Structure formats: structure tokens, C-alpha cells
Amino acid sequence: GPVPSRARVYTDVNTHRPSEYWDYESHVVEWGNQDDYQLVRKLGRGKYSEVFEAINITNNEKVVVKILKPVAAAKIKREIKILENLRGGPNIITLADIVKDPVSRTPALVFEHVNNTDFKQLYQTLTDYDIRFYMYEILKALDYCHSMGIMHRDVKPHNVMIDHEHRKLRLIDWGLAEFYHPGQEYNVRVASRYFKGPELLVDYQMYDYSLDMWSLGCMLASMIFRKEPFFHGHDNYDQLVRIAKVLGTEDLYDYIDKYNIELDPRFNDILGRHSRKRWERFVHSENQHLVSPEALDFLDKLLRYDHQSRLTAREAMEHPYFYTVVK
Numbered sequence: 001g002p003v004p005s006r007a008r009v010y011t012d013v014n015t016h017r018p019s020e021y022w023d024y025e026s027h028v029v030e031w032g033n034q035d036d037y038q039l040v041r042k043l044g045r046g047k048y049s050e051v052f053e054a055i056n057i058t059n060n061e062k063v064v065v066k067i068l069k070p071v072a073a074a075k076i077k078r079e080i081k082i083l084e085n086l087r088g089g090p091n092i093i094t095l096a097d098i099v100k101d102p103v104s105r106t107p108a109l110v111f112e113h114v115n116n117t118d119f120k121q122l123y124q125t126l127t128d129y130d131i132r133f134y135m136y137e138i139l140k141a142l143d144y145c146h147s148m149g150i151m152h153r154d155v156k157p158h159n160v161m162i163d164h165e166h167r168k169l170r171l172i173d174w175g176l177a178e179f180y181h182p183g184q185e186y187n188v189r190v191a192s193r194y195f196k197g198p199e200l201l202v203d204y205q206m207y208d209y210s211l212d213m214w215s216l217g218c219m220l221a222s223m224i225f226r227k228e229p230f231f232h233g234h235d236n237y238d239q240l241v242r243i244a245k246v247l248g249t250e251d252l253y254d255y256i257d258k259y260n261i262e263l264d265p266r267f268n269d270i271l272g273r274h275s276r277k278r279w280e281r282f283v284h285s286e287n288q289h290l291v292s293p294e295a296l297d298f299l300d301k302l303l304r305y306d307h308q309s310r311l312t313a314r315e316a317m318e319h320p321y322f323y324t325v326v327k
């Protein structure tokens with residue numbers, strides 16, 4: 001069978017905190033008043049919820065209302081407990097209320113509003129300094145949630161709201177977040193394709209906070225190399241081949257051999273043999289302004305097959321890539 005794995009940091013957090021902290025099923029939701037909120041406009045719909053801009057008419061503040069669809073409505077206590085546990089943490093979105101939508105008959109989460117700057121505009125114009133600045137702000141959120149015994153599991157730019165005018169960043173959409181318990185086998189059908197860690201792609205269930213650090217590396221590589229997405233898989237199998245074309249197949253085989261994981265035999269026809277590439281291969285005249293020796297070294301330490309070998313969020317904050325960032 002597979003060799004077990006445990007995180008190298010924050011393994012004990014859910015053990016030393018009381019059962020009420022992580023046992024989200026035992027949590028009793030204190031329901032707010034849906035009548036306190038007035039929906040203004042629909043911002044969007046995913047497969048988990050419909051999102052609206054709204055006004056809290058009791059104190060006149062702008063809010064965001066996420067009305068859950070039945071699929072996310074079953075695991076509500078988990079998202080609620082995680083949001084309440086993380087509330088007040090650096091760069092974590094604030095859950096302001098939980099109400100029952102009168103039409104859907106489902107729970108609606110009410111959040112603080114963030115005046116998010118156009119995402120295409122940020123991808124196209126953030127400078128090298130701004131990329132470092134915002135990456136540092138994301139690391140504050142990730143180290144906080146990891147230190148609080150939670151993995152986000154859906155780190156990607158769509159889940160990071162940036163108010164560029166006020167240099168304000170918030171990590172949102174905690175719908176796929178989980179409490180980390182050493183030895184627990186988790187569902188590998190988490191994260192969006194292009195951000196999925198090799199652990200998910202090889203069906204290794206005993207993963208941890210380090211999955212977020214792979215996703216963070218994917219976001220950085222896309223941004224600095226001007227290649228969206230950096231690992232462009234056609235499906236979950238080709239996703240691993242795209243990774244192997246960069247990191248190489250020898251380190252992939254070392255990884256699966258360390259954890260006694262077997263690849264799906266369907267990889268025999270598509271994987272091939274690939275050398276590990278030097279990160280300088282992805283540099284060119286249209287992205288060199290966003291690249292540096294420190295950025296490449298940092299990326300090298302996040303985008304590693306072995307989830308135990310990646311930088312932790314706190315180690316990542318110490319990296320030379322962030323020395324230029326004003327603290």
C-alpha cells in the first residue's frame with residue numbers, strides 16, 4: 001500500500017485545539033436576518049453558488065451575498081466553521097453573517113465587500129514589484145490558515161480579490177477548504193485543473209497544506225512568464241505530462257517510488273521520458289521584466305513533485321524574492 005505522509009509543520013494544531021474548533025458537524029449556526037439585506041445585482045454563478053452585491057440596510061454597508069446551491073449547502077457547517085475560525089486573520093475575507101435565502105431555501109453567506117480591480121488589467125499591468133508585494137500578502141493568508149490547521153485547496157487568482165487602489169488583498173472561496181488531520185485521506189477531486197498538485201494527479205490522498213504551495217507556484221509561474229496557464233493540460237492525465245515536460249520524469253518516478261504510488265497504466269502511452277528543464281528556458285524578451293534570479297529560485301522551491309520538499313508558507317516569506325518588498 002501507499003507509504004503514509006504527514007505535514008512537516010502544524011501537524012498538531014487540531015489536536016491541541018478543542019473538538020468544537022474542528023468538529024464542524026457539531027457546530028450550531030446562529031442564523032441572521034435575511035431582511036437586513038437587499039440584493040442589488042448578480043455578480044455571477046459558479047457550480048457552488050450565485051453571488052450578489054447587496055447592501056446591509058441596517059448600517060448602510062456594501063456586502064457580498066453568496067447563496068449556496070444544494071451541493072455546497074450540505075458542507076455549509078465546514079465552510080462556516082472555517083470562515084469563523086479564520087475571521088480577523090491577515091488577508092482572510094470576513095464572514096459578516098449567515099442567513100436563509102427566502103427563495104432558494106438555502107443558506108446565504110454574507111461577506112465584506114472588496115472593490116476588486118479588473119483581473120485582466122492586473123494580469124497585464126502588475127509590475128515585478130507589485131507581483132512580489134501581492135505574493136507576500138497571499139503568503140500571510142496561507143501561513144495564517146495553515147497555522148490554524150486549515151488547507152484552502154483552491155488557491156488560484158479567481159479566489160484572490162485585489163483592490164489595487166488600496167493595495168488590499170483578500171483570499172476568498174473557502175468552500176473547498178478542509179481541516180488538516182495527520183493520517184486523514186482526503187478527496188483528490190479538489191482544485192482547478194491547471195493548479196492541481198502532482199499528489200492529486202497521482203491519486204495520493206494523504207496530502208496536506210503543501211498542496212496550496214504548489215497551486216501558489218502555478219499562479220506565480222503563469223504571472224512572471226506570461227504563460228496562462230503555465231501547465232496547460234487538456235485533461236487530468238495530460239496535466240501530469242505537462243508537468244513532467246518541465247520537472248522531468250526521473251523526479252516523478254522518485255516521488256511515486258518514495259510513497260509506493262503506482263501510476264495508472266494509461267500513462268504508458270502518453271508520458272514518455274523528459275529531462276528536468278532549467279527555469280531560464282521560459283524566459284524571453286516579453287517576460288524578462290517580471291523575472292529575476294530570485295524569482296526563478298523561489299519558483300524552483302515551490303514547484304516540486306514531493307509535497308514534503310516544497311517551501312512552507314512561512315519559509316517562503318523568508319525568501320530573497322521578497323527582500324525588495326516594503327515591510
Ligand SMILES: [NH3+]Cc1cc(Cl)c(-c2ccccc2)c(Cl)c1
Nearest residue numbers: 119122123131134157160219223
Ligand atoms: N483576481 C485578481 C488577481 C489578479 C492577479 Cl494578476 C493575481 C496575481 C498576483 C500576483 C501573482 C500572481 C497572480 C491575483 Cl492573486 C489575483
Ligand SMILES: [NH3+]Cc1cc(Cl)c(-c2ccccc2)c(Cl)c1
Nearest residue numbers: 265266267268269270271272273
Ligand atoms: N515505462 C513506460 C512504458 C511502458 C510501456 Cl508497456 C510502453 C509500450 C507501450 C506500447 C507498446 C510498446 C511499449 C512504453 Cl513506450 C513505455
Ligand SMILES: [NH3+]Cc1cc(Cl)c(-c2ccccc2)c(Cl)c1
Nearest residue numbers: 280283288289290291292293296
Ligand atoms: N529582470 C531582469 C533580469 C531577468 C533575468 Cl531572467 C535574469 C537572469 C539571467 C540569467 C539567468 C537567470 C536570471 C536577470 Cl540576471 C535579470
